[PDB]
């Protein structure tokens, strides 16, 4: 995505796992670090990635 | 026995911005969540990008 658009405040890229172990990807931008450790708290699953990124 | 090649526990992977305006990274392979959060809280320095990956 253009880095004018994509771009505010910081990215944050989770994926973690369901019942048929086929897993749920998703991103979640223009945001900050404080809400980064929200999805982080939220979890309370089977992580496999984690990604975060201060845009631009 | 420890991490030869990523393979014991989570891989993390962090990059901070030094005063020179360029990034050095932080890698950490066979780490776990909760020292991410050590990592993650000690580190301290202008984060740009992190990761978190469990192992391979």
């Known amino acids: ?3 004018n658009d994509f771009v505010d ?3 944050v890229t989770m994926l ?8 749920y990807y ?5 945001l900050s670090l ?5 999805l982080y ?3 309370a699953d089977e992580i496999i ?3 975060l990124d201060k845009v631009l």
Chains 1, 2 share one sequence.
């Open 1 to 3: 995505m253009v880095q």
């Open 9 to 11: 405040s910081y990215d």
């Open 16 to 23: 973690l796992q369901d019942d048929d172990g086929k897993q």
């Open 26 to 30: 998703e991103y979640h931008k223009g």
């Open 34 to 38: 404080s809400d980064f450790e929200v």
């Open 41 to 43: 708290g939220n979890t």
């Open 49 to 51: 990635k984690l990604r």
